[PDB]
């Protein structure tokens, strides 16, 4: 496999202290993923640490990473402070047959952050700071000349800039596309996948807002909102909280029938009892609004009033609107009372 | 358990 540089599944065998191109000193392997690896390297020229994403030596992955590179380079031509919620690509090169993207070095992701709390949740104040930054990143991506859909927003793809501070960035535009250049129907990580993607419908930037809504509840409860083992189970778990989707969407959905059944009179139902009846698992209770927050652990904390939890719940319900046409958009999200 | 980006 590539003269002993690659392995049988196309990864570079990382070796600590290897120097690439009289420039990058590889320190260590920090992450392994389905598309490649990330290594910590020191760049001698710029005298700084960088994270180098080493992609697979196979054409399919190389072809998708070239779009990623293209999207990151496109984003870097906008001077707006908003692009700073997106990880920065410093450069890219080919090395021993792997495409390599050099990124700024960031700290750990928000799943790892919940892990510090033993999955009890970060506070509402921190959740709100994350929410404002993500809404701003989504606003940036919705810039008409970008119109970028991330397509895989989840806690693992949001990284803290530093362990002791609350600034975050979005990483991994490896499944991303621009509006009108869609390619795959099976997208988004399952917990964070929108109904539109589940029902096989056309989709747009709103799918990222759905992911963000699921993410923000999880950051505060410590637990995924909708933890499906598969699509049917995923849909049923969405239905426990938000009810049966509207008829007008179901009538247009190509895969309605994977999850639902349409009676001769038009009205739609779940296929023919493990799940709670539809709409009976209220976010009001999942968040513990009047019962002291998640697990009643935020009873008496500043910033965690019934009023606050009511603003948070509201914003989330607007992010989890079944209709992509009316689902809250970043510009309006940023004006919601939760952020006042 | 944590899924899990759809793959190529
Ligand atoms: N879909 C998951 C995206 C990650 C990922 O975290 N990519 C990064 C991109 C850019 C970046 N800049 N600093 C980073 N920090 C870390 O990787 C890291 C690792 C361990 C502890 C703190 C920070 C990172 C990580 C990933 C992981 C493994 C392989 C790939 Cl190809 C991508
Ligand atoms: Cl990445």
Author numbering:
A (entry chain B): 136 to 407, 413 to 480
B (entry chain C): 5 to 12
The article reads:
The dual-specificity tyrosine-phosphorylation-regulated kinases (DYRKs) are an evolutionarily conserved family of kinases with five human members (DYRK1A, DYRK1B, DYRK2, DYRK3, and DYRK4). They belong to the CMGC family of serine/threonine (S/T) kinases and are categorized as class I (DYRK1A and DYRK1B) and class II (DYRK2, DYRK3, and DYRK4) DYRKs. DYRKs rapidly autoactivate during folding by phosphorylation on the second tyrosine residue of the conserved activation loop YxY motif (Tyr321 of DYRK1A).
Electron density for 8 of the 11 peptide amino acids was visible, from P−4 Ala to P+3 Leu. The peptide binds in an extended conformation in the cleft formed by the activation segment and catalytic loop. The hydroxyl group of the P0 threonine forms hydrogen bonds with the catalytic loop aspartate (Asp287) and the highly conserved Lys289 of the catalytic loop flanking region and Ser324 of the activation loop. The small size and lack of charge in this pocket explains why only substrates with small aliphatic residues at P+1 were acceptable. However, the binding pocket is extended and so it may also accommodate substrate arginines located in the −2 and −4 positions, again fitting with the observed DYRK1A substrate profile.
